[PDB]
Amino acid sequence: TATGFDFELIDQAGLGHEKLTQARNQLLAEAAKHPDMLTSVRPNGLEDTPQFKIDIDQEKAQALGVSINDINTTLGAAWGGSYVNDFIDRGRVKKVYVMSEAKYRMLPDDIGDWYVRAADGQMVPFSAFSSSRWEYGSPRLERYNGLPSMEILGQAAPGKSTGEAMELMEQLASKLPTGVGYDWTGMSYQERLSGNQAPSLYAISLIVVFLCLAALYESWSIPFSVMLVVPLGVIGALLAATFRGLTNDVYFQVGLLTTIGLSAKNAI
Amino acid sequence: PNFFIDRPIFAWVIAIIIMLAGGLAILKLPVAQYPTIAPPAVTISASYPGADAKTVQDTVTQVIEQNMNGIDNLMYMSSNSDSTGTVQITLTFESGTDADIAQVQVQNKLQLAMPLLPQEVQQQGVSVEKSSSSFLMVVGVINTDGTMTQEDISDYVAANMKDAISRTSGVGDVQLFGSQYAMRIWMNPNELNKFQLTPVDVITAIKAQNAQVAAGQLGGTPPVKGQQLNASIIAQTRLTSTEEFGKILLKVNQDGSRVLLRDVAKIELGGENYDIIAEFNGQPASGLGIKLATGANALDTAAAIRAELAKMEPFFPSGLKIVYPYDTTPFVKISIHEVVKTLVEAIILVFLVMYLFLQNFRATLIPTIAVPVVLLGTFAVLAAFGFSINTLTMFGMVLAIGLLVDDAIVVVENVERVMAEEGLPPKEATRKSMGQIQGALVGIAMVLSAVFVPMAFFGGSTGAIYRQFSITIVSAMALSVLVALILTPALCATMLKPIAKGDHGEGKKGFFGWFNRMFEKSTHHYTDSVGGILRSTGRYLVLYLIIVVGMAYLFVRLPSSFLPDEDQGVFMTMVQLPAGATQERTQKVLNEVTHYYLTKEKNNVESVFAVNGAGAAGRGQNTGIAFVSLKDWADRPGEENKVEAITMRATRAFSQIKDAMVFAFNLPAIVELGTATGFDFELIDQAGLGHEKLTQARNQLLAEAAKHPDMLTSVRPNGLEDTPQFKIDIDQEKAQALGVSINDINTTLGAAWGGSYVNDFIDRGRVKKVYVMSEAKYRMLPDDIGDWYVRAADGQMVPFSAFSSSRWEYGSPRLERYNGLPSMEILGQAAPGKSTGEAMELMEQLASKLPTGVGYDWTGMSYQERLSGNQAPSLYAISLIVVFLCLAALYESWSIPFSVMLVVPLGVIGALLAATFRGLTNDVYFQVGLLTTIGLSAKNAILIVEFAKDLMDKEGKGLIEATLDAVRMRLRPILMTSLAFILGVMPLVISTGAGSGAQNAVGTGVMGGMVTATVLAIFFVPVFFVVVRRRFSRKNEDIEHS
Amino acid sequence: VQITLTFESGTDADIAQVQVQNKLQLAMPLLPQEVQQQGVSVEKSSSSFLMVVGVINTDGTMTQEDISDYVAANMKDAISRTSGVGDVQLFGSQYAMRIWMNPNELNKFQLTPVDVITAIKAQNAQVAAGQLGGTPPVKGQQLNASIIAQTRLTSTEEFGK
Amino acid sequence: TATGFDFELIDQAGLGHEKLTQARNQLLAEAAKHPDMLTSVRPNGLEDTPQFKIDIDQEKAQALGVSINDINTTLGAAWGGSYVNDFIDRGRVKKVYVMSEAKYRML
Amino acid sequence: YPTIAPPAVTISASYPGADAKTVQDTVTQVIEQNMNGIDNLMYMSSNSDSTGTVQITLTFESGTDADIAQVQVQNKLQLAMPLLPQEVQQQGVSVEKSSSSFLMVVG
């Protein structure tokens, strides 16, 4: 979604909707204290809007001779709408929609102007069965691995590089509720993956050219003598990368592997 | 090749690198029980709640037998239109074809049949599933302090287990044992007769009144200008408790006392089904059945699933403790340790021989160094081949130790001795040894690869089983041979000490066994002796004919197998109550069984799992199942405490002292197999007939094949026999008069006695079903037909006794199919001592002689085993023909490979002989053993015969004297190797504990085979060789060639 | 209606064909109901007939429709299931219960087609049954037996009556 | 089948069956006018045959107290036919069809 | 770039007007329950949504073959299939292998 990451904040425990929301605004407000590492820290999801509850009381209408199906459907097709059948426009199939007009469906009182025809032949106002209130609700509930989560979106401050901001993220996600954890997905997921490889590729590949060297062109000491050369290759690649403004990424890794490469050739 | 002799470190690099290739190839290497062995099948099932046999066959089943036409890799279609509403079609497919291909093909050919379903199915789905019966696990859930009962456990099971524990790293399929909660509404026909109300008005009540609904939106799009608000309409909402459902309005009386559902019927948050009952040691329990994941480890599915269950275990309710009645894990954990263990012993024993013969610390160590580089590096050969290190393949390794060390060993000997016969420096005498015995090692490579390959190209489950050894012992072979071109030769020249010409060691040490002379003294006896026989050939020709012949007769009188039987730490006993009995009598049997195990075998049994309601043939209150788990293997000693005698005395206990057929038994090794001497005859109705006629055919034929005690065996049906059904024919005339509506009569009859799935509600935050069934007592006794009244069009009720005739006819409750057409499952077998196919010939002759629409056809076990049948002779003729031509090749003739081929009988006659004594069987493990024996025999003959012909040629010596020299100098190695083998293989041979059926089976055939092979070949081969060559060429002669 | 989708050569055949049928069900619920009730068959197929086996009656005393029935009664269930067959066009037709409405004799008795339909629908079906001693029963209970119900018809008699 | 084709003229703007019929005719005559490039330029298929509209005056039926739904389904099951239920012949399922009789739907 | 991102099958449907927790715990996590046994899964993303659109995005390991994925997974959903709504099941339901990256948008 941006520069380096898409921090995913994961629910693991059995805590709650409210409380978690409080823990995260806690983090998004707790991080505004870092201009030397972060910039444009923003939240992901839809929060919680005002909902308009309309309870229809079945008894009062179950007398009056109006049928429930009819009242439901009319309320619907009025403010939602309906797919009936299909027609043939210009030589192409399309849908058919029957919804109310505009002005009778923007404000609650317009409910009034709506009457349901009973079994006898007289209409009934909704104000004959509908209590109405202002309560609250959520629209779109986010998850990561099926469980409640929030992507604290961000980019690194204009002060160069992307990963230091991610490591600083790892320091933010510490001081919050018992059951509130951290993970990376997408751009920084792989930045978890191409990062903590440093021990393994070098645990292995270093041992391999060692034996490759004691091999076809023989000896014991020859791989040691040549192998002391590896630091000499890096300290300049490290020296330069710092001097310019870069970061230990992939391109620096291939940059490195390559550099130790020609260098080992030479001592070879 | 020779080249790496003068690059010792380069060699070293190959050694330490390959050993590491090993360790890295081990740490993340997969382990299973066996390799994925069984042919894959996909099954289709559907649920038609309340239907009868003819119904789920005739509404769901037959419209299907018509619309999923055209899936590839067609094979066969077996089906059950259960008279419980389940319809189940198992397509069992051709071995090793890719499953998933089938699976999607089918799921998208049912959606062709989908509108052509009934609508209660159509709303309740149809499932297509790749399938086995191989439960990795059955995990029980119980509460200790009687806190919850089966439906509570079941509900929690469905709400708190199946999404987060099955997130654990290592898991395939999940299956719940019990029933999910559903809103259970129990209608009383009295309190429903009262207010003239019937199920339909109730149906319509809960349906219309209980849901979410099409809302709409304030500021709906497209709104109109000026607008400064956008917001969502809420509406009629689905319900939540048992409370919100009693308060539901059905009809208001004119007096004003409204009638809610709470009145006419009873309300509990209940189960979606009350078929099967799950008892953990009698106490209430509900369970889970788990299958392993797609290339996943069994033991890590175990580490993570059991860690996961332990992660929700305090976060479980009170008393709620998880249980493990059924795991196939410790059997495997312990299988592995026992097999490594034997291998460890094998290593140490081999090394012992290796010392107590070579007696030089650094020379005795070189071939000991020989072993890790070879195995560890073989694991590297496996990690790259995409198969798994299971019991069997790693068994191929423990078995392979012999064909490993043999080469390396021979070389250390040949060098040590040449160094005793030419005096040259370590490296040079070595060089000569390597250049002269190249043929020994490349030869063995040529023929063992030649004998273990032909099996890999075999078919079936047993064939794949073979694939595993092929690769292990051949990789082991080739690498041991190839280490013998890079590793062993450089290790030979370099880490080995230099000898002057003729050092011999004879009684040149006292405390360390003068021993060597004896060997040397003895080989004089040996050597003069071969000469003695060489002088007098005819005798030895004849006696050979003896061994051959004996080998033959004896081969016959050794009985086959498909795999050995295994104490798995877990076995089961199943229950069967006579037709139409109820759940109650069965439950009597389950806890009575539980008594037997916790009492008269109290010490052995740890936990019983009693299942009431569906067992073998199908689902059905009269049918039961028990999982009996034992205390860990360490605490079960004797003959009496192991699965065998336990099963024996269990079924002994129950057969003659009960009214019901109830049998205890032990599960196979392989979690699905050919039932050996036998079949599962499918009797196919082809002509326009019907169920009555096939059944009469079952009578006819079960009478026709059971009347031959000399060919046929176990004429029995597998299924449930013919049950009592109660036809209630409604005479429509009368009701088309009285003003009652047919839909009203039907759906009321249903919702009363079967029941109806009507709507959905939301318990605890999870959607579940809403069920309205009548109550117990108003639809359990025939007499209750009465208490039910239909509200007419005018307004008064009618009894069912106003239109309903009522009788008892016959039907089978489990309707079978074979390819969409009417069929019947006759399981059957050949006499214990008749081949199964002979029984196929006489059974086909009876079931041929049956009415036209009663035919014969094959399914399951006897199917594949019919097409892929007449081939084993051909491939082992190949393993042999590859032996004869490949070694005719490494040398350069014909007569010279014959002399080495003469040894296989000396080898065979030993595997029969030792095995026959024990009681083992010409199955697979004895077969792999047999091949290996062939290898051994030809190996040794390679040793001797190679040296004699070489001399004959290139130094031109005389036959008899050359055979004698070879025979003399090669005695010593032949013996070293062979002792290493017998002693290495031994532990397997006598070990008890996991799979010892396996260990013993490999071991015995292999051991006895090796013994007679050598202890006879070292006296026959030189006479094989001499006479064989004496009928080819003219001049020479007995060669002097300078 | 026959819609033939021709795929890129050497493509996975079956993967294609199946992909097709799980895109049949995005458009399938909003289909006509006379169709949905008369099935649609999606079948991987050549662009021509590979083979035709004929069947005839020796004494000729069978009609196209008779022979055709026999085909449908003993063989043509697996010919579309051989691991290489798409649609088979059956030369004939399997039997159907044929009710031939007489429009005079229908004006006679105050009934029209609509009434004939709802008539035969309702009169001809299986029915939601149940079980004597149904589960879960109560103690002492000693019976479980199959409730049969009205059964769909079988003869020419059941359909005239 | 040697050197040839299977030309598809696809209607793209949405001018319905008629304009397509005529464009194709225009074309089919336009290719018969070049024997120095084409041979057997023929359309493959069927042309436009005589069809018989039974246009319903819904009104006359909307006073008269008849329900249209039934009227349709009657014309249908009469001259087309109707798949209604399934039955069991000799132990094997088949279909249930109610179509008019022969002589009562041919002229 | 190469096939870099882990493979996901997305399911989307319309339940016109429903709420967040219905389409989260009736429509979304109602499938992810039989999604035990997936080949090479990396992570799981999901939407409830309050306009009637419901989204279940199941995400697997790079190169784990898509067509293959929809194989095992559309057939692991079509096993988790019973706990979703039927008003969902009647109006346009898509199972489609997905990225979230418009390769292009043409105006």
Ligand SMILES: CCCCCCCCCCCCO[C@@H]1O[C@H](CO)[C@@H](O[C@H]2O[C@H](CO)[C@H](O)[C@H](O)[C@H]2O)[C@@H](O)[C@H]1O
């Ligand atoms: C357990 C029962 C079966 C196991 C026995 C299988 C055979 C292995 C035993 C070999 C040892 C006895 O072998 C017997 O003594 C020696 C050496 O072999 C030979 O005896 C020889 O003595 C002189 C020596 O010139 C004769 O000229 C001639 O060469 C031969 O008669 C053999 O002809 C044999 O008859």
